[PDB]
Every structure is written in structure tokens, then in C-alpha cells.
Design a binder for this molecule. Structure first.
Ligand SMILES: Nc1ncnc2c1ncn2[C@@H]1O[C@H](COP(=O)(O)OP(=O)(O)NP(=O)(O)O)[C@@H](O)[C@H]1O
Ligand SMILES: Nc1ncnc2c1ncn2[C@@H]1O[C@H](COP(=O)(O)OP(=O)(O)NP(=O)(O)O)[C@@H](O)[C@H]1O
Lengths: 294, 294
């Protein structure tokens, strides 16, 4: 029983936007497209998610839940909903994240990712998480697959539909054992997320079947130290994996730590060639969602 | 082919009651009055509807249909028929709803209506609707104009003569396009009804001519978010407007949701001054219809 969520839900007209090409398919198909607000001579690159041509009282009810959340947030590192279209099949309109999920991006670009990028991503992701924590919101599926890339310099947390006010391999123990989820178990997944980024996109516990994890983590085992990782960075990952959730670090601390490290990247991440890394129709009225306010 | 409708139709003697003053005029004139059952030393405030001094095989046949329905219902949030008088012109006798239609009442009283009232009205109306749904009855003209106010604390659904076992602006799409009406399209009008109450009595799509609606609603457009409405309440309105009728919510759910909200009104409706709102011949033998049983 807290404050009134006065966020506005913008309903869009089927015509206000147009699909351009499929982006990926799950049980919803996402398209890349443009949106032209009522009468504004502005064009906005967006992503249009459309429940499969189906319409099951359950599928239709989930996408809406997701819409409720996305609309109730506003932070530079969290995907915000732009609006929805109530057509035969419901469509969610979000900002276009050109480079896709961070997971694929580190894989597709290992050879060009430097410590600065990596560390800034950790900072950015932690900021978004801290934001959700302020809004007393518990993302319950934080992973490299759910971080989208607007630009190599700017990522944003997404996919927090399943979020509250399965990926057992990213789950804290309390969650796995007693379906308990707090901002702190979010930290645990943050740890694994970070771990994916440092291993340039590896699979956590690849091999070990979901069934074993609970026991494993109970023994005292964890994900290994990624090669590029100084003991400083690894230490932090480990702390996020303490069995005792209150003994794990707080996102605002995680921000503070990774920022410190972000000021002298080569001291905390050792990457061969770090120093030489480098990362990337009338479009006159194009404006990125981030500049299309209220 | 279901159960036998054993409701009793009470025929009243012209003399058993007396008109007091006109209440409003349509093609039937309604008077405010009193009814004194045969020999009972009880006086009942009532409303007497009398077909215009005319008597056309069609007009006379409609009022009777209405009587059939009203007599076949019994719920605290549905106007029940008290009896009818077979005089030169037929007269329907219903319980007096002192404060009139809810539509006028929110208009005439904006400045004194708080979230608690609003939300309880949504609950009450939904209860009456769920009742009709149980009696497999489809009100086919649910709107703020057809909800009467017994007291600011107690409203009742009415005007379901046109009901089955035009207001295009309150109509679901299936109704507008293929004259299809289910309890679910009732939900759609429920949505608009609610929407009128939150906009303190506004006209849905004011401006847009009846001709456009069908197409509009098809594009994906809807009624806007009323100012006092948190995204939670608005969300529900929207769900009632899904093109797919089975993906809209069920009155018993609508009851459940609005009740939850009714327990902490200020969290779902933001109204300036909500906290300081306030709403309202020998009459020794007066008894409200609701206490005059069987
Ligand atoms: N805003 C976006 N911009 C660009 N690509 C996106 C965007 N949102 C999703 N995608 C990608 O489109 C494909 C489908 O995404 P999506 O519909 O979210 O399925 P999902 O993430 O596997 N499960 P879910 O999010 O619950 O539907 C994946 O490659 C997503 O990473
Ligand atoms: N039971 C009642 N108590 C007080 N006012 C009523 C009652 N019933 C109707 N009225 C009002 O009397 C006026 C005429 O109502 P009514 O005869 O129902 O016309 P209508 O609702 O416009 N169309 P209809 O109901 O089909 O005849 C309107 O202001 C009604 O809201």
C-alpha cells in the first residue's frame, strides 16, 4: 500500500506506425519499424511486439501485464513502453534497440570489446537495477539475454514482464529452493549477467543439468573466474553469490564499485589488445525515443 | 430451454397509489409518488411510469416486455418492478430512486465525489451486471444514464427493457458490426460507464460522429485516460475494450478488482481534496421498497 501509479498508458492508432521487417520470434513476434505520432512531423524507430496471430486468455493477459510495468518506469537504463495498439491482436510499442540483446552482441563482437565497454555495461545495468529497486520492483529474470543495446555505449534492462512488485542457472538459491525473490536475489542474477559479459557470452554451468544446481550451489561451488578478470572483479561476482542474501552487495554499491574500476579499466580487466579496441528512406525527421518526451 | 420463470407479476389497483409530481419525460412520463399496499398501513416511495396518453400496439407492447424482465429479477443492484396497473394507459411501478440517474449526479456533484464513492459504484454496478449474467440476461444498454441512485451509497442498474436473454458510443465492436451481443459486450459498455464516472460525467468521443466509431475502434484507438485515474484503473477500462470479447474481463473479476482498489481508494484514484469529500406529509409509515418483501 504505497503511492498512486499515475503513469500514462498511451494508446496508439494502428496507422500511426508501420512495420518494416521482422526482428525475431517465444510466443510473440517482434518487428523493426517506425512510428509517426499523431501530427508531429517526427519519425521514431521502434520495436513492435505482436502476440502470435493467436489470442488466448492467458497469452493476451501476459503482454498486458508487461505493458503495465514498462509504462510505470522511467530511467535511462530501463526499456520504457511507448504505447500499445488495441487491434485484433495487441501490439506493444517500445524503443528500437538496433544492436539487439547484449548476449548476442558480446558473442558477435568479442574481438572488439574492451574493458571500458564491459565495465560501463556493468555500471549501466546496475543503475537500471537500482532504479527498479527504488520503484520497489523485482525484475525476476535478469540476464545478458534481457539487456538490450541502444548503442555500444548505452544498454537498457528489459524483459521484466515476469517481474513483480525457468532460468534456474541465473537464480539465487532462495528462489530455486523456496520460490523466494527479493531485490537481493536480483543481485545474484546480476552476478551471473556480469559473468556472461566477462566470458564474452558463455553459458553458465554449461553441461551441468538444471537438476544439479540446487545441490551444487549448496556444496559451495560457483561459476569460475573469467580469464580477463582480476581478482577484484571476480571478488564482486562471488559476493553476489553468498547463500545469505543480506550479505550480498546492494546495486548502489555495485554502481559505486564498477564505476571506480571504470576509471582505470586496464587495472581490473586484462584483455589482449584492450588499447586498440573499437565499436560502432528519408530520415530527416528521425528522433530517437529518448528525445521524444511526454 | 432452461428453468421455469416463476416470478410473480403483481397487478396493482389504480387507487393503491397516488402520483405526487412529474420526474421526467422518450415516450413515457415518470412521476414521483406513493403506494399503499392493499391493507397494510405502509407507504412506499415509488416511481410511476405511464405510456404517453397514446396507446400504440408497439409502445404498449414494449413497456410490458420491460415489466416481464424487471419482475424476473431480484438483486440489490438491479431495479426491481413492484407491480403494474392495467388502467386505460398501463403504469409500471418501480422503487423510487430519489437521486436520479448516476450520470446527472456525478455532473451535478463533481466537487464532492471521492474515490471511495466512485470505486464502490464500480463494484456495485459490476455486481448487478454479474447478477444479470447469472440469470443469463444481457442488458444491452449499460451506461451511466441507466444506473439509478437510491442513495449516494447505493446505485442500481436499470433500463434493461431493450435487454435480451442506438448508443453506438457505448457499444462493443461485434455489436456495432454484426449486431452481436453477449455478456462480454456488456463488459465493454461497463468500461465506458466506468469511464463516464471517472471523467465526472463526460461524453464518450464527444465530437466524433457515430459514423466514425466503427473504423476508429478498428484502428486501435480508445477513450483517453481520465485525469483522476491511476494506470491501474485505466488498465481495467482498456481491457474491457479488447477487440477479442473473450479476452475482456468477467464481471466477477471486475468485482474482485474494484473491491481490492476500494480498500485503499486514494492509491488508485487521485482526486484533489478526496479526503474532505462528503455526500448526502406524514412519513411515519414510510418503508423503502427494499424492506417491503414478497
Ligand atoms: N526493442 C527491441 N529492439 C530490438 N530487438 C528486440 C527488441 N525487443 C526484443 N528484441 C529481440 O527480438 C527477439 C524476440 O524478443 P522477445 O519478443 O522479447 O522474446 P523473448 O525475449 O525471448 N521472450 P519475451 O521477451 O518474454 O517475449 C529477440 O531477439 C529479442 O532480443
Ligand atoms: N425509478 C426512478 N426514480 C427516479 N427517477 C427515475 C426513475 N426511473 C426513471 N427516472 C428518471 O425519469 C426520467 C425518465 O426516465 P425514463 O422513463 O426511463 O426514460 P429513459 O430512461 O430516457 N428511456 P426509457 O427508460 O426506455 O423510458 C429520467 O430522468 C429517468 O432517469
Amino acid at each position: 500500500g504505497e503511492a498512486p501509479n499515475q503513469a500514462l498508458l498511451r494508446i496508439l492508432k494502428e496507422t500511426e506506425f508501420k512495420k518494416i521487417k521482422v526482428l525475431g520470434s517465444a510466443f510473440g513476434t517482434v518487428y523493426k519499424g517506425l512510428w509517426i505520432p499523431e501530427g508531429e512531423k517526427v519519425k521514431i524507430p521502434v520495436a513492435i511486439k505482436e502476440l502470435r496471430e493467436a489470442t488466448s486468455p492467458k497469452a493476451n493477459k501476459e503482454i498486458l501485464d508487461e505493458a503495465y510495468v514498462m509504462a510505470s518506469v522511467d530511467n535511462p537504463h530501463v526499456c520504457r513502453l511507448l504505447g500499445i495498439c488495441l487491434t485484433s491482436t495487441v501490439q506493444l510499442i517500445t524503443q528500437l534497440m538496433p544492436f539487439g540483446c547484449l548476449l548476442d552482441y558480446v558473442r558477435e563482437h568479442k574481438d572488439n570489446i574492451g574493458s571500458q565497454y564491459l565495465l560501463n555495461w556493468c555500471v549501466q545495468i546496475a543503475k537500471g537495477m537500482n532504479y527498479l529497486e527504488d520503484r520497489r520492483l523485482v525484475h525476476r529474470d535478469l540476464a545478458a539475454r534481457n539487456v538490450l543495446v541502444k548503442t555500444p555505449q548505452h544498454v537498457k534492462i528489459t524483459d521484466f514482464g515476469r517481474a513483480k512488485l525457468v532460468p534456474i542457472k541465473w537464480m539465487a538459491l532462495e528462489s530455486i529452493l523456496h520460490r523466494i525473490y527479493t531485490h537481493q536475489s536480483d543481485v545474484w542474477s546480476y552476478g551471473v549477467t556480469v559473468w556472461e559479459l566477462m566470458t564474452f557470452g558463455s553459458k553458465p554451468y554449461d553441461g551441468i543439468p538444471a537438476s544439479e544446481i540446487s545441490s551444487i550451489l549448496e556444496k559451495g561451488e560457483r561459476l569460475p573466474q573469467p580469464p580477463i578478470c582480476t581478482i577484484d572483479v571476480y571478488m564482486i561476482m562471488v559476493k553476489c553469490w553468498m547463500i545469505d542474501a543480506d550479505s550480498r552487495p546492494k546495486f548502489r554499491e555495485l554502481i559505486i564499485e564498477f564505476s571506480k574500476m571504470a576509471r582505470d579499466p586496464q587495472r581490473y580487466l586484462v584483455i589482449q589488445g584492450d588499447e586498440r579496441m573499437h565499436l560502432p528512406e528519408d530520415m530527416d525527421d528521425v528522433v530517437d525515443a529518448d528525445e521524444y518526451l511526454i
